[PDB]
Amino acid sequence: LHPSIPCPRGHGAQKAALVLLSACLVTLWGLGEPPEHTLRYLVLHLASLQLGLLLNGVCSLAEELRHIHSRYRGSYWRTVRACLGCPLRRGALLLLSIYFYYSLPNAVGPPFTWMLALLGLSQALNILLGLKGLAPAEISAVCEKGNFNVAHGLAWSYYIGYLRLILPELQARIRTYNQHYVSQRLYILLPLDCGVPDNLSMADPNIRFLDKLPQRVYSNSIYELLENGQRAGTCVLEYATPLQTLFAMSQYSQAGFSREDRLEQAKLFCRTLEDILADAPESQNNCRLIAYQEPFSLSQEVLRHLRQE
Amino acid sequence: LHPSIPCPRGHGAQKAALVLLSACLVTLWGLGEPPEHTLRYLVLHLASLQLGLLLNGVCSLAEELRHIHSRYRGSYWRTVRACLGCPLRRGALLLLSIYFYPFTWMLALLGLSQALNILLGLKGLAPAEISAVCEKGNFNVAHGLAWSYYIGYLRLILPELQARIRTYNQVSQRLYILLPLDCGVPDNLSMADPNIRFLDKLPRVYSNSIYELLENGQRAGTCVLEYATPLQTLFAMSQYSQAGFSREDRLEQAKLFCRTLEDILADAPESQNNCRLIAYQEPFSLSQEVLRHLRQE
Amino acid sequence: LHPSIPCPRGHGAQKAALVLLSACLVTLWGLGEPPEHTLRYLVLHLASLQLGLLLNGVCSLAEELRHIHSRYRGSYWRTVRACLGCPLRRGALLLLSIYFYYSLPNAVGPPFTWMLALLGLSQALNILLGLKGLAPAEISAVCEKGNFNVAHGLAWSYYIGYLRLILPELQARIRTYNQHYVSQRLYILLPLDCGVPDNLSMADPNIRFLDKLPQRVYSNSIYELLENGQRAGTCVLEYATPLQTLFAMSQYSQAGFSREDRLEQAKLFCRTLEDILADAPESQNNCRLIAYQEPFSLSQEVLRHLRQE
Amino acid sequence: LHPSIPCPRGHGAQKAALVLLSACLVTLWGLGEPPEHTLRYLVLHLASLQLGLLLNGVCSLAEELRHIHSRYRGSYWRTVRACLGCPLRRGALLLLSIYFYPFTWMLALLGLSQALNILLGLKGLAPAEISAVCEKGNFNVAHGLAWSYYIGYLRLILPELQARIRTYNQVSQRLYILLPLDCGVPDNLSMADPNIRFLDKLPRVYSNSIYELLENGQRAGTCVLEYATPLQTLFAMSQYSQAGFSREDRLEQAKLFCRTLEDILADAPESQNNCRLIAYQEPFSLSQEVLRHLRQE
């Protein structure tokens, strides 16, 4: 393609680690220290590192528990899974550590508690002082692991392509429509299931096409909402086009894009678009975002936002 | 918006770390070990951790030095900066360690343990931390832009492209997407080079253009040449002042999106000998660069 | 559904393991032995178990290397991956063990070599005497892990549904066709890519429809093969219908059925069908199986099997 | 057939084990440790491994006792047999261990290690061993049969079923698949029960039947009732003598395929309030069993 295009990161770090392991093993052999001390240091280092990761995961879970409904379907198992790996394993070594602590001969106890408290203090400093800060090489590695982090791209493409050019003149469009023939402000429907029908009527019988809007093609339709048959106001309704890409992404079947990733990114896209639109020059009192999940009547969902005006 | 929608991650981890700090300091006060030993061992532990991170970065330098020209503009300083997380904080911690000071035995032991951390993958990020990085901002746009292009314009153009090409000769058989890493694409391709001029079109409504390529005023080839639409988004973002999208960030996402689009098309069913990508960067004649791919047939 | 229908196996074994861990930890605490001996035994046991798994994986790789092209694309990395887990990790601990062995003070060496040889002998006995035999509960767990082991089902369904009822009267069909208007024996095309076109002609321009066959619907077509324009014999050609299911399985996009699993099971189905047909009463000299991979002209592939007759 | 097609796995592992045996015995002869100590420690190691496998099976008994009625016909003997791999070989090894004989300390230690083997998943099968089991024979047919039914008949019937139902009333709105675990399905449903009789059909060619259900000679409901096609395959296999497919194996795959088909339809897009599965087993009136699901609406 181009020599300036980065190739995907390989395993040079693993090769460097192999070389470093060989060099350190050779040096340790040369120094002539007993292998027992090497094994002891490795066991201690691994145990200390995993206890530090346990403390870091507990600290994160103290914050990740706040998104229990939003992120982990309200079940604690996945929240603990996503914060400190396998909870069954972690519990197994937790009980092993409790046994070790309660089985010391009391001539080693307070020293061991002192060491444990020092490790906890070091981990707390690491979290508070930010010494566990990812280098941007590692950040880039995470953000390039797979081609699924589409939420930011979809949100920004949507904004620039459509909303940056629709909203500025939309108010004038609605004004001329009202003068010639209410319907205030654009409404973007955000189904987290990302099910976008061709037209809105089959999605909800209380939403029926009324008319188009004057003035590329920029085909925006005016929809009227019926509450118990009575038309309880009308509004310009519109599905989020980029949510069609996520739906088609999962049906692609060669991307490996699952339904769970479909919902995770629709949720991320839902938040990102609001953040972009919060400070956008041409979105103040000019559009509304309606996010809903199928378990519910769409008409009432849209109607609730018209009352606030 | 909707309760299921996650809110951005807060500072609860910092509060938990503060609680842990309070508990640990209360404990240390309870035991009665003298403060100086506690402080000395704390600085020793922090110094060991920082030198271990230095070794981890040096190991990562092996991988990051292979992208010296592609990713870091042929500058070693940039590569080392990208390998070490916080140069200032690590510098301060190493300065404290130096102030507070066999010996080669523990250097090898600490290196051996760090080597096994990389090899056995013990520093792998948890899903909570993987996703936290992925939503740090709103500038990881390359993946979404590439999938939007494929699932949108490209998937519904490639399989019918060979057909419309087949009715024109009675012109290359591939769709040629130009990808300038500067993301500067004009309305048409005449301003790009004087050697490319509009010829005709190809029968929702899809508007594809034929552009004949010539050398020294003489025809030398013709193909369906079209800019990549989602580069408008990358360029328009940079001009959008309130985003904070810089040229370096724009140029980074332009490259990743270029590579991402290639992997999508590598395994795609509709891109078999149908699509060709031309990634180019002005230090240059566009016509010659495209013509190189035309002669590749 | 039905109380006689087994539910998917849960994690009762994990709960029993937790209870056993708790009981053994309590007993160890009661006995009052030093925790150091417990930690030493655990480290020794884990190291011994992983060395035993390394030896078992090496023994398997001594046989898995024989299927390098067929199974692992001719690359050793995946073969070593599929036999003994991560080879980088295994190499890391292999070098660590070499360092430990070469760093003993020569007053422990021969004892350690004796222990290592005993472990190797025990592993060799385990493999040879079959003491590492999976209980049928575990076999059922593996065979029920996911709904992808479709090869045996597809092969048997194909046999019973189609071939058991087509082959017995096919020879009579070809005989009456020849008498009324060569073409001997059924030919089943087996594309490992499982790309089944609606008709054969677009797959290969040298295969063109000639006629159907007399005598449910049982629509079998007679195809003529052209070599350099000259018709080099004709034969009853037919795609393997169950390979359409695998192709549609991967395009389903909600099953998680990847292209690699598509090829793995098509390969397994290819072998299973031959095994069924080897001893089938009505398949002796009555059908041929043609397996091919897209990198190749289909006509020559089919023609090669007509020469042998 | 084709070189890429894997051949069935041979006995190369046994040859490698023989080579390892030769090397290890040559080593033991070289060192000069007396034979009796070697043999005694070998039997001790084998006894420890066998008792560890016994503990692993006892732990697996917790999971296998929950399927006592479903999987093992309500017999404890069957469950214990299914948890322990080779009762005879383990019995012989434990007999040798008993012949060759603190003490409770090592029992807890050996149990603790076995507990962590299960909890940390250190006995997980490698991909080579996972696939070796999956191709031990050719009787793991439940997965393929279920996917063939869905991707074939079912996927192209369910979405147009509600339509053809909607044109008939001017009848239940679901397709009812009967799944007798004996795999015995007649040509039509009249022989099944006298309370089910053919009524009419529903407009490649698909032949769906309407079957009215009645009680005491009185109409009580009507629905599209049809047997599961791939149960013919399971039953026909058993009658096929050269396969070796027994009733117990047929009944095992019938159940797994029944459950497998439910998971496919649980996440399917075309089975939303469209398909209902009726798994039944004669120790019984079929009409009453189906009618229970009819009233569930």
Ligand SMILES: *OC1(*)(*)[C@@](*)([O])[C@](*)(O(*)(*)(*)P(*)(=O)(O(*)*)O(*)[C](*)[C@@](*)([C]O(*)[C@@](*)(=O*)[C@@](*)(*)[C](*)[C](*)[C][C][C](*)[C](*)[C](*)[C](*)[C](*)[C])O[C@@](*)(=O)[C]C(*)(*)(*)[C]C(*)(*)(*)[C@@](*)(*)[C][C](*)[C](*)[C][C@@](*)(*)[C](*)*)C(*)(*)(*)(O*)[C@](*)([O])C1(*)(*)OP(*)([O])([O])=O
């Ligand atoms: O097994 C393995 C495991 O482990 C893993 O996981 P992770 O997350 O990575 O974890 C980690 C561990 C460690 O590391 C490793 O791995 C190895 C090394 C060694 C170490 C030593 C000891 C330590 C201390 C403790 C005491 C007991 O972590 C930890 O630490 C724990 C341990 C346990 C586990 C393992 C065992 C071994 C031992 C040896 C001795 C020397 C993953 O999972 C991987 O994969 C593996 O698995 P598999 O399946 O592959 O086999």
Ligand SMILES: O=C(O)c1ccc(-c2nc(C(=O)c3c(Cl)cccc3C3CC3)n3cccnc23)cc1O
């Ligand atoms: O593998 C894992 O995930 C894992 C998770 C958690 C732990 C873990 N270790 C301890 C120890 O006190 C301990 C042990 Cl027992 C042996 C050697 C050295 C040490 C101490 C230096 C830190 N400890 C105390 C409370 C809570 N947790 C743990 C170890 C793991 O290996």
Ligand SMILES: O=C(O)c1ccc(-c2nc(C(=O)c3c(Cl)cccc3C3CC3)n3cccnc23)cc1O
């Ligand atoms: O984790 C893994 O995959 C893994 C893989 C391989 C090994 C591994 N251990 C040894 C040892 O001699 C050893 C060590 Cl060094 C410390 C304590 C006890 C022992 C011996 C009782 C067996 N050994 C010798 C040759 C080849 N391999 C290994 C250990 C792992 O943990």
